[PDB]
Amino acid sequence: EILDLTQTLINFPRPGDPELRIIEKKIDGFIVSEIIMGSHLCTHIDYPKHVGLENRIPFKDGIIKGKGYCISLDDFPGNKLPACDILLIYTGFSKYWGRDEYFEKIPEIPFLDDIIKSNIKCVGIDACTIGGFEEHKRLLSNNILIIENLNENLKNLVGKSFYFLGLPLKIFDIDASPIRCIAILE
Amino acid sequence: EILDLTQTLINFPRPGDPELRIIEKKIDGFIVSEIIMGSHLCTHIDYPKHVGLENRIPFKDGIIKGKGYCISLDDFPGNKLPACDILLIYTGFSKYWGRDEYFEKIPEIPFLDDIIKSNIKCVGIDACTIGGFEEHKRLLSNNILIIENLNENLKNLVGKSFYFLGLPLKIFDIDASPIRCIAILE
Structure with a gap:
């Protein structure tokens, strides 16, 4: 039915970035609580403002939606990209979520060219x-959004077609927002 | 298709509450940005912790979902509640969103008794x-969650059946979270 692809919000910022602080009174x-967080904390979507460009409205109401497909980074060598609105890339790096090592794991995506020529609207990755x-700028400058720090459930989606929904904090004019992402399976 | 029921995040806190501050560097x-916000800012869900009780897991992954129904507060006098998981209540007070007057508009819901006897899991209101x-405690103490500051699109949903999705900031153990809410219409 619904698979949650979001990491639980925790104080696990990229080194250099603002810590999560939740102040309770x-x-x-x-x-009641006050939440202090960087815009790139945990599962988040990057907008073009993050690389100094102007944001646009690729998605109505800023709601990321459409047909999704998930590919494995290691399996996907010289392939046709799937026909989809949202492409998820499973790296396996989510295995290391919450461990410092995680921020040293940098994917190498050889088919970025092909993504830029496709009608893909957003790319997400674990x-x-x-x-x-x-x-980042290559994708964002070509009106392709980026979702980072998706969870290990992408493993379950490899080769599958599903419907994707990404619901951010309804802010416009920001570089990035925390985003809650789900897959609706048939 | 999809109707967004969320207010845009703005610096419109309940008087007394933390202001929204977004610091850009x-x-x-x-x-990159730092976001500082109270947990009750704009469209948000209340958990039982807000009234000093223990949170539970009424919804898998904390994803608010199910059949929704929307009723008009003024039309709904001595009625059977709709059969639904999520009950939305349209007050018309959303007309005043962003104006100080808004926080002086306090709904009177005479059928709270009936909600407590139903199998409704969450109540949302504009x-x-x-x-x-x-x-609040009456509902929360009986495992019914509360979503506040929904937008004027509830007007469009009155009398309609739809599927409801509420995707909060994935925090557990908090009194409240900003929540992005949509209706999927058939």
């Missing part, structure tokens, strides 16, 4: 990055 | 509150 019998500044 | 050609501490 007791007031008149209610418990890793901290799809690559460097240049790789 | 330029670093090595990237633009208003700042469903009522006072006692009304």
Whole structure:
């Protein structure tokens, strides 16, 4: 039915980045909190503003949706990309989530050219990055959004077609937002 | 198809509550941000911790889902509640979103008793509150979650059956979270 692809929000920022802080207060019998987080913390979507470009409206209401397909990075050598709106890339690096090692695992995606020529609208990955500044800008400059730090459930989706929904914090004019991502399986 | 029921995140806290602050920095050609927000800012879900109780797992992965139904508060006098997992209540108070007046508009829901006897799992409303501490605790203490500050699109849903999805910031052990809410119409 529904598979959650989001990591639980934890204080596991990229080194250099703001820590997660949740400040709880007791007031008149209610418990209330303040949340302090960097925009790139945990499962998040990058917008073009992140690399100094103007954001656009590729998705109505900013709701990431459409047919999804998941490929394994190691299996996918000289292939036709799947016909999909959202391409998920399973690296296996999610195995290392929550461990410092994780931020040293940088995927090498040899078929970025092909993604840029496709009608893919967003790429998601179970890793901290799809690559460097240049790789991010290459995608973002060509109106392809990027979702990072997806969880290990991408493993379950490899070779499968599913419907993808990514619901960010409804902010516009930001470089990035925390995003809750699910796969709806048939 | 998909109707977004979420308010855009803006610096419109309940008086007394933390302001929204988004701090943007330029670093090595990237633009990055820090987000500071109260847990009850804009469209949010209340958990039992908000009234000093223990959170449970009524929804798998914390994903609010199921059959939805929307009723108009003024039309709904002595009625059978709809058969639904998620009950939305349209007050019209969303008309005043972003205006100080909005936080003075407090719904009076005479059928709270009936909600407590139903199998409804969550109640959502286009208003700042469903009522006072006692009304919140009455629902939360009986394992019914509460979504506040839904938008004016609830008007479009009155009398309709739809599928509801509410995707919060994946935090557990918090009193409340910002939640992105949609209706999937047939």
